[PDB]
Write a protein that binds this ligand. Structure first.
Ligand SMILES: Nc1ncnc2c1ncn2[C@@H]1O[C@H](COP(=O)(O)O[C@H]2[C@@H](O)[C@H](n3cnc4c(N)ncnc43)O[C@@H]2COP(=O)(O)OP(=O)(O)OP(=O)(O)O)[C@@H](O)[C@H]1O
Ligand SMILES: [Mg+2]
Ligand SMILES: [Mg+2]
Length: 252
RNA sequence: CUUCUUCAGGUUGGACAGCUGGUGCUGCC
């Protein structure tokens, strides 16, 4: 049903972080009652089932939800629908839970005949890679508040990190729709030369020099140097946002 | 039976310098 995009099947596995701990010791001991525990349980279950149904039915979503139940989530649908509903899910969970419970997800791209058992297993281990996220290896236990985006090693977050990646994605989508339609061939050049930076650095600074060299009447070099500015501090962020932009805008 | 057989300066200087278009589609689980 998509016109510009990719022919991949995206899935979502959202698991609330430390819900079992939120039941063991999350609720205050002084405010401990059977009615209050039942209220919290029913609120969470109603949230998941009912509000997932209503949130998808609010407007046209290409999602074919497999399971909501409780504390878990499975979804299969259009790849871009999975990506743009992950943010909706995180913001709705934050609003309903008042930013008290963390959630983790995992998204995988699959063909039209990929093994669905393999789909689920890969999405589960990506979910675990999102569950075991720690900015620093000093504090006990994991933050658990992360999302893996198509790879177990690509553990991004939902915080200001995801804010940055989505701001970058929106900016790139707005800017790079209308190039000269001929100089855009440098995009794959950048992608394949930034795939990993632990090796010959000569070509990276060479591409920087080439971008500086490119001089005509265009948007200018404001964003053409913002690419360089974002090409050093944010390496994995730039490659992830750029790959998301490419997959969204690929003429496939 | 004379008296120089060429000497001294400019050796390239500017202008453009790669643009446009396509850009993995079909067949199978
Ligand atoms: N009222 C109540 N219900 C359930 N467990 C309760 C309660 N009071 C105390 N406890 C204790 O908590 C743990 C729960 O462990 P578990 O039995 O594995 O059960 C599942 C699941 O049945 C239950 N669950 C899921 N959804 C709900 C809702 N909506 N309401 C109540 N209970 C619910 O919680 C467990 C889910 O396990 P995980 O998803 O793996 O936990 P996690 O948050 O994802 O951890 P992490 O991977 O992020 O680190 C028992 O000890 C029980 O006695
Ligand atoms: Mg859970
Ligand atoms: Mg669970």
């Amino acid at each position: 049903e998509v016109e510009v995009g990719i022919n991949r099947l995206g899935v979502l596995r959202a698991d609330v972080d430390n819900l079992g701990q939120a039941f063991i010791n999350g609720i205050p001991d002084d405010y401990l009652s059977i009615s209050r525990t039942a209220t919290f349980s029913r609120a969470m279950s109603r949230f998941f089932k009912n509000y997932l149904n209503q949130l998808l039915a609010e407007k046209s979503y290409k999602i074919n939800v497999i399971y909501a139940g409780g504390d878990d989530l499975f979804m299969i649908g259009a790849w871009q629908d999975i990506l743009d509903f992950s943010i909706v899910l995180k913001q709705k969970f934050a609003d309903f839970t008042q930013n008290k419970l963390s959630i983790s997800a995992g998204i995988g791209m699959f063909r039209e005949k990929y093994p669905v058992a393999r789909m689920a297993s890969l999405t589960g281990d990506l979910e675990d890679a999102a569950k075991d996220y720690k900015p620093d290896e000093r504090a006990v236990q994991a933050t658990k508040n992360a999302v893996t985006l198509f790879d177990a090693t690509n553990v991004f977050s939902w915080d200001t990190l995801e804010n940055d990646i989505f701001v970058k994605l929106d900016a790139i989508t707005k800017n790079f729709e209308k190039l000269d339609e001929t100089g855009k061939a440098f995009i794959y050049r950048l992608i394949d030369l930034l795939r990993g930076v632990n090796e010959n650095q000569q070509i990276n600074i060479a591409r920087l020099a080439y971008t500086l060299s490119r001089m005509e009447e265009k948007i200018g070099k404001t964003f053409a140097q913002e690419l360089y500015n974002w090409a050093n501090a944010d390496r994995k962020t730039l490659i992830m946002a750029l790959e998301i932009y490419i997959l969204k805008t690929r003429e496939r």
